[PDB]
Design a binder for this molecule. Structure first.
Ligand SMILES: [K+]
Ligand SMILES: [K+]
Lengths: 120, 133
């Protein structure tokens, strides 16, 4: 509960800056981190059984986005449930930062002066 | 005498709940509020010269979104500056909540267990230096 020692985290992101920064953040608390740059690579790493304890899922990726990739992880797990009678549920947290920042850049680009924080 | 007393706010939003909430809230601070359901209505209300002190701009609207409408509010001001030399710069604040809500609803629908709001900050950020050749 204080450190991530003994945990293995999958970071999926198609931005090399995100992959490097997330991994260093998680490694500073002792996580073993594996990075994937695409949904296909992530699905290949998540063949059941795998040893990952949690996954950070970039929602915006070409060819397969994070929603699709998640849908297929859940299909993989449902298949395993049916054939092994054990329930696999990898924790998956979406990484949305790049949808929100892109949104803020179009606001500024269009000429808006700011935005409402925690808006109406 | 309340905080926005004497101020007139244009709320542009195509969702009736936001219009009702934004306007009620702003009126409690003493603002006179006008609501618009579309960018075209907003552009019509912002004929220069106008009496609006601020504008809240829904970024996601059919037919004309808030970026477009903003883009044309700025052309109006630039045209005025060019032709009259008078400086108009309406304050425009983006309303982005419903884009974040939809994204968050899509995460749930796909099967994710949650989301990270704030991005990963890097540790030694202001610790970098400019090194000279
Ligand atoms: K991305
Ligand atoms: K909207």
């Amino acid at each position: 509960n204080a450190l991530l020692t003994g945990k293995k985290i999958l970071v999926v992101d198609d931005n090399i800056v995100n992959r490097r920064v997330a991994a260093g953040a998680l490694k500073k608390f002792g996580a073993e981190v594996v990075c994937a740059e695409s949904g296909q690579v992530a699905l290949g790493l998540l063949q059941i059984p795998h040893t990952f304890d949690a996954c950070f899922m970039d929602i915006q990726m070409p060819q397969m986005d994070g929603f699709e990739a998640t849908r297929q992880i859940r299909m993989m797990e449902k298949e395993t449930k049916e054939k092994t009678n054990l329930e696999w549920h990898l924790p998956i947290l979406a990484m949305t930062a790049d949808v929100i920042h892109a949104t803020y850049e179009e606001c500024l680009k269009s000429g808006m002066d700011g935005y409402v924080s925690k808006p109406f």
